[PDB]
Symmetry: C2
Subunit: 484 residues, 2 copies
């Protein structure tokens, strides 16, 4: 296993490259990513899958430069897989040899089961829910993996894809009704159902962006975006029939216009069949699954319990000294417990409080001025694997507003109907703030009790600075705070 | 040391700064805190002898400051004391008491030394290096004359906000101050405002002008235009000051501070005051850092630019390539854009820093790079220069909006068209540097730019349509 690993995926629509960098045993992050839409499948579907010359030439040229990029980052391992368009191709051996000849890259053609597995491995490890069904919609095929509690159960690969449907129906000028009936037949082959889906791939990313723009969503990242599938199913169905200009007005990018409608059609049929309630947009897929297969060597390729690669790598990069963050987290927990009779907050939020406690001072790596704002910025933007947007929102807010009143008008606080109340957020940010004050100095054996409305801080230390600072805390409710 | 803590003991408060040195010249301020222990409380009536309860407060605070220094693993701890302690007949008692409690060894410095440290900071860390520092404290006021980063002269005035609040709180107080201020031997068009009292006054002026940038450091004030309002602040009742945004702790000193400042500015004949976020603590640190360099960074050495790269850009090969192509493209396209070469400064640095944000996330990396620049490129850069560099990065491969706040932060800012040109040039340079390309050369023929290469540059060609052009222009690959 290597410190710098490049994974290249040759799909039916585009070729894509990811460079992953190890920061610790389980910590890693995505160092670089790029894609080229070479559409190697262009014109092949009428030819019984034979890859056409011009598309093959485009693919070779892109892949040669992907090799250059891999070497630029000094990758010690370079892994290359090819999916539906290449595996289906009668001339696949010719194409593989041409790439090896030009680029030195050895393509591993993977079957649909393996493709579904790699997607499943990524989603089972890197999302904020571990039970659900992946939906990976590509140009030539669509894969679903059923995951139960982090374990891959079943796999299905279907030959329906955005470009396949485009070229066999929407080009030959067969009605949308015909395309739909054909997709429905293939989708009937999926035996399972689940409330959760993990959306994988470019079609689903593009459609996610459409919904974010349509609804004025406050958060920029794609990974961990939660879509109400029922609520949005009709609109996804409507996209199928839109003109390209209507797609442009929804913010669809120029290169996405020609495949997004067949993609929406496949997605709508699949969601309906799986009986999906929640779709999580996944920024991860086959490339991550290939990397995780190489990173984690044990039978199922799973992270050990309570190991999060994104939280770990964030600390590796920006917080290599862990003592202070740990102590603040510990006092946050003790304070939350002592104050629980007053606040009555659901213990599920201890998850968010603990991580805010660890990361609140991360932003000092940038500047002392507005350090908490910077931590929040880092949290919202860089804490990805294993966290929902809602998770990041709560954590970001606790840090950002430390020693401050949270405004009634904050957009992130309102990002969903399921967000905690302002009062809950203020409680949690207050607890973090007081923990920070108490942990400023070298202070051991802190203990907290609640006597009536009164929080009592027990310490053997003088705590001079913490006493001085007490009036600058913003309390969620009037609360008497005393030092024994 | 890698981590150095500097503690300074003033009349009103004790302050701590922890500095992290990332390379030979790179460093940044890691942590800071203050405690207003008012060690000088009631000491004037007593012949300047520091009273028991105030000394007890100082010792408790300093003890915990020591703990903080150790929690940051500081390998060097430097502690200086200024006018209140300096002037105290029991200063030896106090120094011994502090050493007994936490082990801290206090170095009492005189007024000239205090002026020197403030001067070293302002000489190195601001975007102009010629001028006169003004450091207004509770017990004294220091001024250092700096010429091109070198310190020419030093003086410590026996006037501070405490005594002026005591004796007077305008024609009278001003009369007393003037007596001391007349002792200033020098004048300059530039002043560097130092200290929390002047920073508080600067916040008031920044809030009232609606300033798009947050940093106090490097904030420029027109000394003539704002003198009236500075003098006004002196006569304001506490209630009004509170409305102007003045923090609770600074209400006692901000009026007498405003009075001293107005007298000094008039005497120095200052036309421009640059608010400094640095002072004695940074000066003590730099005295050590620069001891072998004559207390000045060598030419083209900027500690913030360097420390930014130390933190976020460990490998510079790619960014030096982008910079180099930025310059070559600028010079090839100059007949068309006709842009002032002074902006090559900003373009080169945006070229160096554009991919910095990738360390945070590859998604929206340019937005992160911009965020880093705006917030962390601080020492030695003017607000305008920083804003330009931020914009070029932020808007790579995009159209810059007409209403942009940062772009409009002043009338000396470049035009939207100039900004779009520079952002476009950066964007094209980034495209050409994606792969492992060999020597590139550019030519211009009317509105046609020609890229000459022995490389296929397949990806760069594919990406071409995603570039946002400032004018109609033809880009071809030879």
């Amino acid at each position: 296993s290597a410190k710098i690993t490049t994974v290249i995926d040759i799909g039916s629509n585009s070729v894509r490259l990811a460079v992953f960098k190890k920061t610790s045993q389980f910590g890693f992050y995505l160092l670089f990513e790029t894609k080229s839409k070479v559409r190697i499948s262009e014109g092949c579907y009428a030819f019984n899958g034979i890859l056409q010359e011009i598309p093959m030439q485009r693919a070779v040229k892109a892949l040669s430069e992907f090799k250059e990029i891999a070497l630029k980052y000094k990758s010690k391992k370079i892994l290359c897989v090819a999916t539906s368009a290449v595996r289906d191709a009668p001339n696949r051996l010719e194409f593989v040899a041409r790439v090896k000849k030009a680029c030195g890259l050895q393509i591993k053609i993977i079957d649909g089961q393996k493709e579904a597995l790699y997607g499943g491995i990524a989603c089972a490890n890197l999302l904020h829910k571990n039970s659900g069904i992946t939906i990976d919609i590509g140009g030539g095929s669509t894969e679903c993996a059923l995951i139960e509690k982090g374990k891959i159960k079943d796999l299905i690969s279907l030959d329906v894809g955005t470009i396949r449907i485009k070229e066999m129906f929407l080009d030959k000028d067969l009605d949308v009704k015909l395309a739909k009936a054909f997709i429905q037949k293939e989708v009937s082959k999926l035996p399972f159902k689940h409330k959760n889906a993990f959306g994988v791939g470019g079609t689903i990313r593009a459609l996610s962006k459409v919904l974010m723009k349509r609804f004025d969503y406050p958060i920029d990242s794609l990974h961990g975006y939660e879509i109400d599938a029922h609520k949005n199913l009709a609109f996804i169905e409507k996209i199928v029939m839109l003109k390209e200009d209507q797609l442009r007005l929804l913010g669809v990018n120029e290169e996405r216009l020609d495949s997004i409608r067949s993609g929406a059609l496949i997605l709508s049929v699949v969601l309906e069949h799986l009986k999906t309630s929640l779709m999580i947009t996944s920024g991860v897929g086959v490339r991550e699954g290939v990397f995780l297969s190489d990173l984690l060597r044990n039978h199922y390729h799973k992270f050990p319990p309570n190991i999060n690669p994104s939280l770990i790598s964030l600390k590796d990069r920006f917080l290599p000294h862990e003592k202070h963050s740990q102590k603040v987290k510990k006092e946050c927990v003790k304070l939350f417990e002592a104050l629980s009779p007053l606040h009555k907050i659901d213990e599920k939020y201890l998850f968010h409080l603990k991580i805010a406690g660890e990361l609140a001072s991360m932003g000092k790596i940038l500047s002392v001025y507005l350090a908490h704002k910077h931590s929040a910025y880092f949290i919202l933007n860089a804490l990805s694997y294993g966290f929902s947007h809602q998770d990041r929102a709560i954590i970001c807010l606790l840090a950002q507003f430390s020693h401050k009143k949270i405004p009634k008008d904050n957009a992130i606080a309102h990002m969903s109907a399921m967000m905690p109340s302002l009062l809950t957020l203020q409680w949690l940010s207050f607890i973090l703030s007081l923990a920070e004050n108490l942990c400023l100095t070298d202070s051991h054996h802190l203990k907290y009790t609640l006597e009536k409305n009164k929080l009592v801080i027990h310490s053997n230390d003088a705590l001079y600075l913490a006493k001085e600072m007490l009036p600058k805390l913003v309390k969620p409710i009037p609360l008497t705070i005393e030092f024994a």
